[PDB]
Amino acid sequence: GRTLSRWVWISLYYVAFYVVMSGIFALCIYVLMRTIDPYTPDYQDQLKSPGVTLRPDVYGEKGLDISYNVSDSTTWAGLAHTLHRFLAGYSPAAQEGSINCTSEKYFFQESFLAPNHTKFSCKFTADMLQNCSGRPDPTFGFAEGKPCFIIKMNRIVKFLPGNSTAPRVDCAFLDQPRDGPPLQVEYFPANGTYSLHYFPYYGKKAQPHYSNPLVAAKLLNVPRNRDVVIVCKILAEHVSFDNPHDPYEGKVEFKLKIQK
Amino acid sequence: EMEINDHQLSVAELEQKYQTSATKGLSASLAAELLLRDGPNALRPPRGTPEYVKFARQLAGGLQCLMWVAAAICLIAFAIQASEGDLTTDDNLYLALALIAVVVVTGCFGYYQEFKSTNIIASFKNLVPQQATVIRDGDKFQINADQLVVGDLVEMKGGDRVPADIRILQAQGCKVDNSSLTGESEPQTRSPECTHESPLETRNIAFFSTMCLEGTAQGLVVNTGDRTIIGRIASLASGVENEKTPIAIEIEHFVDIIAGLAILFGATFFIVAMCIGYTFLRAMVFFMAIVVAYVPEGLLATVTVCLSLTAKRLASKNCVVKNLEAVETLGSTSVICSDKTGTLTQNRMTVSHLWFDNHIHSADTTEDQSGQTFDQSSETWRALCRVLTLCNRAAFKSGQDAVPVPKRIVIGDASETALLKFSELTLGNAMGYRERFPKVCEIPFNSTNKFQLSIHTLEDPRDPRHVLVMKGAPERVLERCSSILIKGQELPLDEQWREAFQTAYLSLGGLGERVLGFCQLYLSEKDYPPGYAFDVEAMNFPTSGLCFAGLVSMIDPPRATVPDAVLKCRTAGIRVIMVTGDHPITAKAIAASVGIISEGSETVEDIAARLRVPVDQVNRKDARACVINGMQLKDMDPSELVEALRTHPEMVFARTSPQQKLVIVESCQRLGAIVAVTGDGVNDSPALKKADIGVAMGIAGSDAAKNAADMILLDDNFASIVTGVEQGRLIFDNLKKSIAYTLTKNIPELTPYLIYITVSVPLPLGCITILFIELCTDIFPSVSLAYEKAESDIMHLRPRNPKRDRLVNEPLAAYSYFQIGAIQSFAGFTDYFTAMAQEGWFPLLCVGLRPQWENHHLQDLQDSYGQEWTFGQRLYQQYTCYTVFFISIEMCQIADVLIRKTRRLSAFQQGFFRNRILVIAIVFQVCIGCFLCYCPGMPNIFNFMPIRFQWWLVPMPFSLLIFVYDEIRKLGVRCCPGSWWDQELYY
Ligand SMILES: Cc1nc2c(O[C@H]3CCOc4cc(F)cc(F)c43)cc(C(=O)N(C)C)cc2[nH]1
Ligand SMILES: *[C@@H]1O[C@H](CO)[C@@H](O)[C@H](O)[C@H]1NC(C)=O
Ligand SMILES: *[C@@H]1O[C@H](CO)[C@@H](O)[C@H](O)[C@H]1NC(C)=O
Ligand SMILES: *[C@@H]1O[C@H](CO)[C@@H](O)[C@H](O)[C@H]1NC(C)=O
Ligand SMILES: [Mg+2]
Ligand SMILES: [Rb+]
Ligand SMILES: [Rb+]
Numbered sequence A: 001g002r003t004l005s006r007w008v009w010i011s012l013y014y015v016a017f018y019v020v021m022s023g024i025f026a027l028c029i030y031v032l033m034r035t036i037d038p039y040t041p042d043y044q045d046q047l048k049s050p051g052v053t054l055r056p057d058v059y060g061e062k063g064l065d066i067s068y069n070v071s072d073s074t075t076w077a078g079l080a081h082t083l084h085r086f087l088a089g090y091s092p093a094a095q096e097g098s099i100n101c102t103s104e105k106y107f108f109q110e111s112f113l114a115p116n117h118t119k120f121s122c123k124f125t126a127d128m129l130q131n132c133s134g135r136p137d138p139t140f141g142f143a144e145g146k147p148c149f150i151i152k153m154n155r156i157v158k159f160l161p162g163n164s165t166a167p168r169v170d171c172a173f174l175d176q177p178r179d180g181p182p183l184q185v186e187y188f189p190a191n192g193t194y195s196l197h198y199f200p201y202y203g204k205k206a207q208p209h210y211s212n213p214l215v216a217a218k219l220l221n222v223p224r225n226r227d228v229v230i231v232c233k234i235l236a237e238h239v240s241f242d243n244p245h246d247p248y249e250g251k252v253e254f255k256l257k258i259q260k
Numbered sequence B: 001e002m003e004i005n006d007h008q009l010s011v012a013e014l015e016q017k018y019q020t021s022a023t024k025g026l027s028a029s030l031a032a033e034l035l036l037r038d039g040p041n042a043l044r045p046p047r048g049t050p051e052y053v054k055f056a057r058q059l060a061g062g063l064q065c066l067m068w069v070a071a072a073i074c075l076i077a078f079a080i081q082a083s084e085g086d087l088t089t090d091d092n093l094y095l096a097l098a099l100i101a102v103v104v105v106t107g108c109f110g111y112y113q114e115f116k117s118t119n120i121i122a123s124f125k126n127l128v129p130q131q132a133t134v135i136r137d138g139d140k141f142q143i144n145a146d147q148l149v150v151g152d153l154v155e156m157k158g159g160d161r162v163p164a165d166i167r168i169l170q171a172q173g174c175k176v177d178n179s180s181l182t183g184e185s186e187p188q189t190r191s192p193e194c195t196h197e198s199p200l201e202t203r204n205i206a207f208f209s210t211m212c213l214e215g216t217a218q219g220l221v222v223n224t225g226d227r228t229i230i231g232r233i234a235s236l237a238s239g240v241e242n243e244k245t246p247i248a249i250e251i252e253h254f255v256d257i258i259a260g261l262a263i264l265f266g267a268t269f270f271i272v273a274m275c276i277g278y279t280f281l282r283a284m285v286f287f288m289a290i291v292v293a294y295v296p297e298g299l300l301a302t303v304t305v306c307l308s309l310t311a312k313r314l315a316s317k318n319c320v321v322k323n324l325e326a327v328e329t330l331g332s333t334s335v336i337c338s339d340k341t342g343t344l345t346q347n348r349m350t351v352s353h354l355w356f357d358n359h360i361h362s363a364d365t366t367e368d369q370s371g372q373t374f375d376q377s378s379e380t381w382r383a384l385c386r387v388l389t390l391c392n393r394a395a396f397k398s399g400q401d402a403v404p405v406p407k408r409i410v411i412g413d414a415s416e417t418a419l420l421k422f423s424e425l426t427l428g429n430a431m432g433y434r435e436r437f438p439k440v441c442e443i444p445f446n447s448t449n450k451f452q453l454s455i456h457t458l459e460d461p462r463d464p465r466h467v468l469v470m471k472g473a474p475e476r477v478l479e480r481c482s483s484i485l486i487k488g489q490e491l492p493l494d495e496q497w498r499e500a501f502q503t504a505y506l507s508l509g510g511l512g513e514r515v516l517g518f519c520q521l522y523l524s525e526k527d528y529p530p531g532y533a534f535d536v537e538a539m540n541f542p543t544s545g546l547c548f549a550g551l552v553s554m555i556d557p558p559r560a561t562v563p564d565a566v567l568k569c570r571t572a573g574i575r576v577i578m579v580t581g582d583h584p585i586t587a588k589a590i591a592a593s594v595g596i597i598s599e600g601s602e603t604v605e606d607i608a609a610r611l612r613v614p615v616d617q618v619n620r621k622d623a624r625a626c627v628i629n630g631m632q633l634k635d636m637d638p639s640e641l642v643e644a645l646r647t648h649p650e651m652v653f654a655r656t657s658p659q660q661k662l663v664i665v666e667s668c669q670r671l672g673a674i675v676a677v678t679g680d681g682v683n684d685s686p687a688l689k690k691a692d693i694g695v696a697m698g699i700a701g702s703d704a705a706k707n708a709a710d711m712i713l714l715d716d717n718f719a720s721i722v723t724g725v726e727q728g729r730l731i732f733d734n735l736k737k738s739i740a741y742t743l744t745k746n747i748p749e750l751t752p753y754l755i756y757i758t759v760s761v762p763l764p765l766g767c768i769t770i771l772f773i774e775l776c777t778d779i780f781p782s783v784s785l786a787y788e789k790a791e792s793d794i795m796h797l798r799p800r801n802p803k804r805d806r807l808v809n810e811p812l813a814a815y816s817y818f819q820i821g822a823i824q825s826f827a828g829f830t831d832y833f834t835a836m837a838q839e840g841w842f843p844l845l846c847v848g849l850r851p852q853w854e855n856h857h858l859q860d861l862q863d864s865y866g867q868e869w870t871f872g873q874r875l876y877q878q879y880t881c882y883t884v885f886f887i888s889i890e891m892c893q894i895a896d897v898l899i900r901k902t903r904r905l906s907a908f909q910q911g912f913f914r915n916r917i918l919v920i921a922i923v924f925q926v927c928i929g930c931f932l933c934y935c936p937g938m939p940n941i942f943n944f945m946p947i948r949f950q951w952w953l954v955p956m957p958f959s960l961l962i963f964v965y966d967e968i969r970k971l972g973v974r975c976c977p978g979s980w981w982d983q984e985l986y987y
């Protein structure tokens, strides 16, 4: 409708308008990523308490659901393989860029002392689960019906879980008291504890080869051919495990069915 | 077809057809039987108005179809999404639900508003049953008019309303008031003799709604109810269908605009959605998300409350409107087709001029008496005043002292009534005064004597003599006068004076006025002593050789505030046309005096008068004014009429039928104008309905004119019409402001979405919050632009060209969407990436990260600092992105309103806080914004969270940028009126 020599002036105006505005946006991100530090989050407002995940993680609907047949290895090979490929990065061969750690308490690294301005991160290799390492049982206790679920807490730069005793994992059911014993769970390493010299996290740029501490909760007492539900809560002084809008901070819940 | 032959039948033929008698009427039996047969003698009101269908009507319109379509799109999209297992499809139900919600809440708002209009107008109409002097079985009794049946015999006197369509059988001195059917302001005489074959122009038919002024008649009813002339004209009027209002057309134009953009954007992004490896199903779900985001959820509510506030303003001035659309119509109006008798004029015979002391004095013809009276000091004036006061039988009805004189009811003849009100305003307590001059002899008006006369004894006992006072047609009084009261003496009435009387008589005649001559003589106390036995038959008093007092002449004068209202409409560029059913002479009289015909403008007839050449010779282009009577109008065609219309600008239609008023409104309307009709009587209901807006008088107006009208002037103040133009021109201009404002925020709620599609970054702006924006935070600041006053001299502007000047145009719409909305979305994304980075996520990480973002099966998702987030956590971070983009919106919106206060003028010129209600709305805006963020529990109920005060300040640079941008748009358009900067950047 407009004149063609106008049309080009109009569109040159809108083109030039967008270029100027995008440019403002450009200089804004430019400034914006300079206003912030690569080794700590400015605010970390949502990470008040840390979340805790579980392996093998398989869901159906409405949270974690895990069922399998001891007699049908097709139902549990996939879980075992989840655990193998997950721990493939906790092998000594892939995790050689760290230090053997025995600090036994908080590992505050005040100054940057590792190659190419990096940081020293502790080492945590599979063999520290001792039964659930993939050896000497490559089914991680599933074949037996004593499954090894490995628990792993979320990492937050410069977060401290408590100084009293090491943060431990307590796995238990909820409404199965009446008929049947309480559960018996063996943890690896023992008491289901996390070594305090793994805190604090200084961030993916500071520690390029960092690896979370793990505890495996080998479940022995769990009844076969029955629907049960297991919660692994974390016990420390600065961990809140129970909040209604996030059921994965401090605890994990999963439905377990082992059938024979 | 019954009535075209009724007035031509012989009396035997009528009493045959109707099984009646002309002397003793129907029998009671057959009269009751006929009443069952034909039904009540009254007009059937509008029946088809079921209470639920009135409400259902309110759920259709431009925005209502838009919103309904969009409601529906939500639901088929919801079906698709739940089909492919998509979660949180709650949002689709929420949105489509609220779309329907605003439609119905506004629907019942408008329903209340119209119901309250109908109650207010029905609160002003009289509900007492009219009556009828009927004669049945040879008995003359009174009954309700609605119990008359065809064939009945009825009677009429002075002041009786004509109860049916009557065929005159016998009549003495009977004249009547036909101003609601014909325009005719002069009383029309009724006689039993067939004057014409058209029942409209015959003199032997009395029409159903009319009023007997004087005299007495008796006749047969030949049609009752909807079959009468009244019933036919009003059934025609409800036969015409009224077109769609200008404002409704404009809203339906921009829903076409919004829809065009919407399906364009939906479409191009649907193909772009497929080329990113999206399912055809999901690709089309995004198509629908888009076209529905283009729909402004809240605009319909704002438009209505804008319109009801101006309805409130107009209603406070006693001007009621039935529908809100009719608020604007006056502003866009280009032509006004106006009735004469009863709208422009008061429809009341008023004393306009007197001739005495050798001079034509001109009285005050207004109803609040704001005009200028005449010289009431002369002795001869006092003599004349005594004559006209004492020679009158008219009488005021009881208990009217509160109400103004012109508004009082009077028991009297046509010209006697006018003269009574004259001495009552002049002399004060007219009938009390004339009681002090006791009346010994009286002769009433008749054709034998041809005058009216009375002899009186004087007021003090010092004066024993008598005074005779006479009035009549000026020549028939002048033949009986021998002297004349001039300048305090009684001079002999010579040939110089005879000629002068005659020239003044004719002078007042040519203005179309009814003129009477008055005169007096003092009978000697010698010849006529107290107690003297005056006999009329044997003329023992003198009937000739009287002394001439003066001439008095009456007219149907304009309503007090009408001439100046016409002047103020014409300065605003509105072409005023008169369509009157009255004869041409009085039409052009009024037309000239009220401003339809300017001083120094003349028709071809008036030209050929001073150029002394045959009218056909004078040039038609040279005549500015023109009068066209109904006979000539019927011989013309559309082609002749349009040339006749756009050759003579000051035009006047005399002797025009209701259909012809319709016709002229139609020719105007097809020539592209927005016609507004102003009317009182039932000869306007057709033209009133066909008009873009029909204005009826609330007092003089008829039930058909009032029903066909979109607007009612309850006080009958014709100057409310000029209030309508400015108010209607105002809110149009305020709507351009307000609609533009509310549309501009649509782009910065759509863009985060469609980048959340293409660049797949976590969702910046969530549905439930853009609802809070559209329906909660910005409705108050939008309707505040109702109150911006004009930026020009709004009332010296021309009517807007309905083709160029539109509520939204491609310039306005495209400017407001893609420049200002673009800037707001850029402030959004800036606050977005900031709230990310400060909380963990880098701009280049956000690209592509939506899939794992929304993924409920990750609980260890790693930000750019390597930290591990659960789902509920990054959910809250997305809610923070909501709230940060939301307040990024609102800050640019505090700026948007101030930009939209003005379209041409700088905000410094007119000020920032001129509009009080706009600032109280901006403070309201910010504090609920804060309420939604920092109130306890808001992250859970809604998707709003307490943001850190760092991010409030991040968009303020952008809002200042727009303030500067449009100020420079407005400074460069105002200081540089050149077309380049104007057309491309103006709205
Ligand atoms: C501009 C925009 N539209 C959005 C949206 O639309 C959905 C739900 C409501 O209605 C329809 C209708 C449709 F036809 C198609 C659709 F896809 C939708 C959802 C969200 C949101 O809250 N999400 C969590 C994605 C955010 C949006 N922003
Ligand atoms: C752990 O520390 C001990 C103590 O010297 C050492 O023998 C061992 O080699 C260390 N582990 C590794 C993997 O080097
Ligand atoms: C762990 O392994 C050792 C050696 O096989 C064994 O003694 C111990 O009982 C195991 N624990 C469990 C819970 O199987
Ligand atoms: C376990 O597997 C065997 C072989 O597949 C089958 O017969 C048995 O019923 C399974 N147990 C259950 C509870 O399904
Ligand atoms: Mg009229
Ligand atoms: Rb929208
Ligand atoms: Rb005067």
Ligand SMILES: [Rb+]
Pocket: B242, B243, B688, B689, B690, B691, B692, B693, B694, B708, B709, B710
């Ligand atoms: Rb109308």
